[PDB]
Amino acid sequence: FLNKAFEVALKVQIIAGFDRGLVKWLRVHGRTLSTVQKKALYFVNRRYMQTHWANYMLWINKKIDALGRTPVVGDYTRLGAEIGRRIDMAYFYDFLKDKNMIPKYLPYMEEINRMRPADVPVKYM
Amino acid sequence: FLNKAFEVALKVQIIAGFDRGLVKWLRVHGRTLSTVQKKALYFVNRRYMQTHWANYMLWINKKIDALGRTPVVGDYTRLGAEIGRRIDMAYFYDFLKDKNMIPKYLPYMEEINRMRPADVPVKYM
């Protein structure tokens, strides 16, 4: 169960960070990509944080524990931003383009894309 | 644009071969996976063929011409069988498995999974 202002800061940072990378990769790989192909690669960012939240959570915690002081939302932004910067997604984007298995844009991918990133639903462990 | 007699024979064989690679992958990467994941993955087989069918069409227009005579459907069944074995989907299944990006099971995907092989929609180019 986790406190909203922490959870949200984690989110806003991580997916924003995954999207800068896609914005950098697309400047040079996107010449041939339809809009719904470019928007399928933004869904992949959002879903990536979903399938990896619990793994990121063990690491957030042991660090938040290591602060000695109470956590303020400020250090949830910093850890969140440090995952956004530290993950290699172009690898993923390359395998999907290279095997032309960039997913087919289904209605529910746009359900996840129309949402404001602080709201993308995750689960736990 | 290909008499459906032949196109049906390529599909049944392509997808069949792709599935014998997946049941044999599942036979060592299973208990660990929910049912919907084993079925997102069957969609991946179908979809891969819909997204690489132009590359099958170039290779089959070529080795059909080389026949020296009119094809009948059995020439199809053999080249469809073949396109179905000289792939190793295992690496594709494993990057979705390690990078925990097996696709989320969505509506459209079980409509394609419901369809007899012989009817999986491929558009001609």
Curated annotation (Swiss-Prot), chains A, B:
Record carries keyword Amino-acid biosynthesis: no
Impact when changing residue 92 to S: Impaired VERL binding
Signal recorded as keyword: yes
Function: Creates a 3 um hole in the egg vitelline layer through which the sperm passes. Does not have enzyme activity. Species-specific interaction between the sperm protein lysin and the egg protein VERL exposes a basic surface on lysin that may dissociate the egg vitelline layer via electrostatic repulsion. Plays a role in ensuring species-specific fertilization.
Main location: cytoplasm
GO biological process, one term: single fertilization
Protein name: Egg-lysin
Subunit structure: Monomer. Homodimer. Molecules associate into dimers and then rapidly dissociate again. Interacts (as a monomer) with the egg vitelline layer protein VERL (via VERL repeats); each VERL chain can bind multiple copies of lysin.
Localization annotation: Cytoplasmic vesicle, Secretory vesicle, Acrosome lumen
GO cellular component: a single term: acrosomal lumen
Alphabetized UniProt keyword annotations: Cytoplasmic vesicle, Fertilization, Signal
Tissues of expression: Sperm (at protein level).
Highest taxon listed in the record's lineage: Eukaryota
Residues of the full protein shown: 28 to 152 of 154
